[model samples]
Target chain A: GVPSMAAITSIMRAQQILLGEVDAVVKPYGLTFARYEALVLLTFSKSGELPMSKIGERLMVHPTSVTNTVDRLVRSGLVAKRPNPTLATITDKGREVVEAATRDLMAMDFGLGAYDAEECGEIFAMLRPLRVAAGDFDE
Target chain B: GVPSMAAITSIMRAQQILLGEVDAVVKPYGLTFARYEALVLLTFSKSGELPMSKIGERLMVHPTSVTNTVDRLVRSGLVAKRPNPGTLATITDKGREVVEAATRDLMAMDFGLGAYDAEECGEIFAMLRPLRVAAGDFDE
Candidate 1:
C-alpha cells in the first residue's frame, strides 16, 4: 500500500537523509534520536510546558510512553517537573535542555534542505496540517 | 535559525515523508505512530515486559511521560504492565496489541519510492556517521 511511485521516492529521500541526519547529529549530546525529539517538542510547545498527555500527542508517542521520557528529563539537569496549576507540567528546565540540545546539536547539523528563511517557511506551512492530522489516531 | 538549505530540506523531508508516511499508515489503527512504535518495542522485549522507564529509554521517552501511552495500550489489550520486570519496576503486558497494530500498520504503509529507494538509502547512510562529520558546519 505504498503511495504513488513519486511519493515513495520522496519518502525514501526523507527517511534516509533527513531523519537519519537529525538522528546522527543529536546522539553525541548523550541523547538518542527519540530523546532529542522529546527535547525539541517541549521546546516548541506553546507554554514551554505541556500536559503529560499533550506531550505524547504532539510528539506522536504512545499514551503510555510520555511518562518515562519526562522522568528522564527530570533526572537530567536539563528538565524539571512542576505541578500544573491546571494539570501536571513538564518544567522550564525541560524546555531549556531541549533548547540547549537543539542549539548545540543544530550547530553541528547540515540543515538538509532548509534553503533559506523563505523555503523553510514554505515547508512549515505545507507540514502544519499534516502534523496535526498525524496524531488524530492516538489513544 | 533552522540549518542549511540542503540540511533543512533533508530534515523537512524526513519529518514529512518517512516519519509522515509511517504516521499515515498507522493513523487508521487509532494510535499515534510513536505509540505504535512503543508497542512494537515492548512486544520484542525479552521478558515480554518492560518498565515504563526502559520503554522510555528505547523509545526516547522520559519515565513519567510513558504512563499514558502504556495505559492506552493496556486498555486496548495491546500491552500489559507487570511489576519491576524491566530496569524500573512497573507495568508489563502480553503486548499482543502492539504486535497486531504494528503488523497492520506496516502493511498499510505506502512505499511510494522506486529508484528513490536507492537514493534515500544512500542519503540516510550518509547522514549516519563519518559522512555527517564531513558536513561540519559549512552551511550545507
Candidate 2:
C-alpha cells in the first residue's frame, strides 16, 4: 500500500487511544465494555428487546462475544433470557444494567455530559454520516 | 454458574446476533470493529489525533491490540506513524480507503433499528442505567 498522509496517521492514533480509555473505564464495573455495549443496545431498542442475532450485529463482534456477554449478565442477575426455541426475544432487564454501566462506566460523565436533548440530536447528526460512511450497514 | 434470567439469556443471544452482523458489515469493508472503532474515536477528536499508549487505554484491550491496529491501518493506506523513537505518534487522513470504508460501514443503517436514538433511546433508557445514574466521570 502507498504511504498515508499525516492527517490520517494521527487521527488513527487518536482513535485507538480514545477507545482504549473507554475500555479501561468500563472494565471495573463488573462489565466488559462489549457487554455494557450490548446492554445499551438492548435497553434502547424500540421493542425494549431485541434478538440475539441483531445484538451481535450492532456490537460488531463475534457471535460468541455476544453470547458470552449474555452469559455473564445472566449470571450476575443483571439480565434475563427467555427459553423458547421457536420465538426468540431477550427481555428488557439486561438493558437496565447496560444503561447504568454506559452512563457511568468510566468517569467520562456520560450521564451528565453537556449533550442534553438538543445536543444529543446534534451528536447523532454529526456521527450519522460517519457511521454511514463506515459501511456499518452495507449488509 | 447459576441459572440466568430470561432477559440475561436473551441478551447474550442478542450479543451473538450483533456480532455476526457487525463482522459481516465490516468485513466487506476490510475493517475489524476493534480497529475501525479506534479510528472513529480519533476522527472526532479535537486534535484529531492521540498517542499509541492512550489508544490502548480507551479500547480496554491490550496495548498489543492497539499496536496491531496501527500497523494494519498503516498497511491499508488509512493512516501513518511518525518515527519518534520514544514517543510514537499517529495521524489519519481525511480521504482514505479505510475511513471511506468506515463511512460505508456506518451507512448500513442497521443498528438494531437505530435503538440508540428515537423512541428506542427512551425504551432502553427506562431499563439501562446509562441514563438513570449520573455519569460522574469516566476516569474510574
Candidate 3:
C-alpha cells in the first residue's frame, strides 16, 4: 500500500478505463480504439501509406492482430490495401473519421483532463526508464 | 498531437512495460500478475481467507479469469480452497516463500522505477484519479 505499488495499479486501471471512454467515442464511427490507432498512423504517414509490417511494429501488436484490423478497415471502406507486399492507406472516408474522432477524443481530453501538459510530460518521462528497461525501444 | 493524447498513449505504453517487468518477477513462481494479486490479498487478510466473489469484485476481473487463477493456484499447492460457501483461502508454506521471492524481485527498484520517488508516484496516481472517480471507484 505504499505509493509506488498504488500508483502502478492506478496506471493499469486507468488504461482500461480510458480505453473504454475512447472506444465509446469512436465505436459509433465504426472504429474500435485499436482500429482508430491504425487509421491515425496511416493518416499521418508521409507517403499516405505504410507497410503492413511497419504498422504491426509501431502498434506493438501481433502480425495476425494487425492483419485482422486491416481487413476490417478495408471492409469498412475507410482504408485500402496496396500491393507493396502488404501496405495500408487511409481513404477519404478514413480521413473524415479520424478528424471527427480526434476532435471528440480531444474534447474528452483523452480521459486525462485532470493534468496539465507539463505534468503529462513528467509522467511520460517517469515511465520512460521502465520501458527502456523492458527494451520497448532502443536508447 | 495534443498533450492529452500524448499522455494517454504514454499511460497505455507504460502499463504494458511495467506488466512485462512484473510478470518476469512473478512468472517463475508460476503466477501471473493478477494471480499474484489474489495471493497477496489472501496473505494480507486477518483470517487468511476471502470469498471467491469478493476476489472477482476486488480484482476487477471476470468470473472465469478469477476462477482459472484460483484453480491454478490450488493445483500448484500454494492455496487451499475450503468448502464453505464463503470460499475461504489458506496460503501454504510454498505460497509464503513465493511471495517473499516476488517481494524481493519487486524491491529491485520496483521493477525499474526509473528513479521515481513516492512523491512522483503520488503525482502519477493523482493524475489518474479523475477517471476512477467517474467509474465510481470512490467518491474521491
Candidate 4:
C-alpha cells in the first residue's frame, strides 16, 4: 500500500521538477518543453517535417495540444504549416533553436543531474515496465 | 547524455499514465485526483482540518490552486470552510467516506502500477529519493 502510493508520488514529483527545469532551458527560445519536443521530433524525421497526426502520436499529446504548439511555433517563424495534409516543417530557425536548447538541456542533464549515468539508466529501466504495460512501445 | 533524457522521458510518461488511471478511479465521486489529495490531507490532520495556506504548503501547489480545490470541495458538500484569520477547510463525513472508497479502489489497482511487486515499488521510491531531495523535498 505504502509502496504504490510512494512510488506514484515520486513519479509525479519527478515529472514536475523535470518539466520546470526543461521549460526554463527552452524558454529563451520561446519554446515550452512540449513545443521543443515537437520541434525535435520534426528534426528526427527524414524530411524535417511531420504530419500533425504524427506529431501527436509521437509526443503522446492530444491533437489540440499539437495544434496549439505548432501554431505558436508558426507565429514565432520557427515552423511553417503546409496545406492539404497539414504538415509541420521545422524552419532553419527552428532547427537552430532546438540545437541550442538541446545543448543547454544536456548540460543540465535534463534536470536529472543529481543522478549519475548508471542511476539514470536504472531509472529508465525501472519505469520501462509501466510504459510497456501502457502500450507505449514494445518491450 | 542518453541516460538523463531517457530517464526524464520515462518519468513524464509514467506520471501521465498514473494520473489518468487514478483520476478515472476518483471520477465517479466527482473528484479529480488533486481534490482527492486535498481531502486526504485534511483527513490526515489531527483535527481533520487545515488552513488554506497550510494546505497549499503541504500539497506543494499554489495558493490559487488550493483555493480552487477547497472551493470545489465546499461546493460538493464534502468540506466546509470555517471563518478564521485565514480560511480553514474541514472534511465532512461524506468527504471521509469518499476518501475511504477512493483509496480502496486505488490500492486495489496498486495505483496503476500493478506491473511491479512490492519490492520493485520500494525500489522506485528509493531511486527517485535523491532527485526529490535535491529539489528540497526532504532532508538528504
> lDDT tens string, model 3, A1-139?
6777878888888888888788899998999988999999887797669889988878777799899999999999998997994889889999998999989988988777776788677767766665666556762
Residue A49 displacement in candidate 3 (angstroms): 2.3
For DockQ, the strongest prediction is: 4
TM-score of each: 0.43, 0.43, 0.79, 0.93
- Retained true contacts (fraction), each candidate: 0.18, 0.00, 0.71, 0.89
lDDT of 4 by residue, B1-140 (tens): 49999999899899988999999999999999999999999888978988899899877888999999999999999999987658889999999999999999999998998879999999999999998888888952
Tens digits of per-residue lDDT, candidate 1, A1-139, equal: 2333334333344444455666667666556566666676666667666787778766666656677777766666555677776133446655555666667655654444334455445444433343444443255
DockQ of each candidate relative to the true complex: 0.11, 0.04, 0.54, 0.87
Candidate 2 at A104: error in angstroms? 25
Candidate 4 docking classification: high
Ranked by TM-score from best down, the candidates are: 4, 3, 1, 2
Candidate 1 chain A TM-score vs. reference chain A:
0.58
Q: Model 4 misses residue A121 by how many Å? A: 0.6
| lDDT of each residue in B26-133, candidate 2, tens digit only | 766667766677777677666556678877766556787788988887787666776554335355563245666665655554433343444433333232232212
Q: What's model 3's TM-score? A: 0.79
lDDT of 2 at A75: 75
Off by over 4 Å in 1: A1-139, B1-5, B85-98, B104-115, B130-140
Q: Where does candidate 4 stray beyond 4 Å? A: none
TM-score of chain B of 2: 0.69
Q: Which runs in model 2 stand beyond 4 Å of their true positions?
A: A1-139, B1-4, B83-89, B94-97, B114-117, B131-140
Q: Counting only residues 3 or more apart in sequence or on different chains, how many pairs clash (N, Cα, C under 3 Å) in candidate 2?
A: 90
| lDDT by residue for model 3 (B1-140), tens | 57777777788787877787788878888888888888888888766678888888777778888789888999998888887756766777788788788877776757545467878788778877766777777852
